[PDB]
Amino acid sequence: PFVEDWDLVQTLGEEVQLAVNRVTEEAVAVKIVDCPENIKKEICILKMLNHENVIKFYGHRREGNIQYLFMELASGGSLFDRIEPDIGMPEPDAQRFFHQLMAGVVYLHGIGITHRDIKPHNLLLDERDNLKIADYSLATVFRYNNRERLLNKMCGTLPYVAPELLKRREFHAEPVDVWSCGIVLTAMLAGELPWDQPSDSCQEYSDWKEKKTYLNPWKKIDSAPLALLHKILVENPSARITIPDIKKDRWYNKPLKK
Numbered sequence: 001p002f003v004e005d006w007d008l009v010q011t012l013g014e015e016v017q018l019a020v021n022r023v024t025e026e027a028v029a030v031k032i033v034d035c036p037e038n039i040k041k042e043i044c045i046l047k048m049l050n051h052e053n054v055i056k057f058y059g060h061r062r063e064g065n066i067q068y069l070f071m072e073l074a075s076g077g078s079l080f081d082r083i084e085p086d087i088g089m090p091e092p093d094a095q096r097f098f099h100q101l102m103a104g105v106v107y108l109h110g111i112g113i114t115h116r117d118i119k120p121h122n123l124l125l126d127e128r129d130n131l132k133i134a135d136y137s138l139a140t141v142f143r144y145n146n147r148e149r150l151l152n153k154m155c156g157t158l159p160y161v162a163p164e165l166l167k168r169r170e171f172h173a174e175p176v177d178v179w180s181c182g183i184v185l186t187a188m189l190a191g192e193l194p195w196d197q198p199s200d201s202c203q204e205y206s207d208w209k210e211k212k213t214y215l216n217p218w219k220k221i222d223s224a225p226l227a228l229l230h231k232i233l234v235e236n237p238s239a240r241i242t243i244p245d246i247k248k249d250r251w252y253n254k255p256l257k258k
């Protein structure tokens with residue numbers, strides 16, 4: 001269970017392994033994949049990444065039919081494991097993670113990359129609980145040479161996906177990632193996801209559009225972050241709040257401490 005000068009010690013999730021260098025004791029994460037055109041694209045995207053709130057790419061090695069993608073280790077594990085079911089987490093902790101998630105998303109959008117699967121399992125934490133956006137297997141280019149390209153592929157994870165993905169032939173990338181961030185903020189503040197999917201047949205989604213916020217999970221959330229969620233989880237992507245306006249929101253700028 002080794003690759004060149006690295007040993008593969010334990011499974012970090014699915015695969016991704018903890019790679020410990022036998023000589024230096026440096027520890028990184030390595031993604032192992034057994035597709036050739038998909039991995040070439042993913043590597044080009046990974047090589048662009050340079051920000052404190054995004055997992056850094058160290059390089060790749062090919063052994064026969066096996067590809068090894070080496071990346072920055074996030075020793076604090078996932079944000080998912082910090083969310084208490086039915087409770088969430090303390091609001092100051094949720095706001096700090098949300099600021100870091102916005103910093104990472106602004107960075108990605110600034111280089112014309114959309115993640116397309118933002119959710120707590122893909123948001124990792126370093127040793128000082130700094131958030132890192134991970135897994136670029138679904139990531140794509142939405143802006144190149146300053147020209148935006150609409151997306152059409154369905155992907156992501158249904159409870160986090162924006163309604164336009166299900167209803168429109170083509171859609172803008174940025175508002176879809178903004179929406180998934182709103183669902184992550186809901187999960188952090190309530191420890192519960194609001195709907196299986198934001199579709200016409202989902203009653204919990206209809207309830208939200210009718211502003212039935214006396215229901216769960218909304219009733220667990222303070223009015224200030226709920227006011228931000230009312231601006232993010234807006235059905236029409238053209239009326240939905242953009243990141244520059246999230247940065248002007250009252251709760252986003254509210255001082256909080258445990």
Ligand SMILES: Cn1cc(-n2ncc3cc(Cl)c([C@H]4CC[N@H+](C5COC5)CC4)cc32)cn1
Pocket residue numbers: 012013014016029031055071072073074075076077078121122124134135136
């Ligand atoms: C302690 N610890 C370190 C890590 N770690 N460090 C870096 C790193 C990079 C990636 Cl891509 C991954 C992935 C992230 C997507 N998940 C999927 C399963 O649900 C979603 C599998 C693992 C894990 C990584 C995780 N826990």
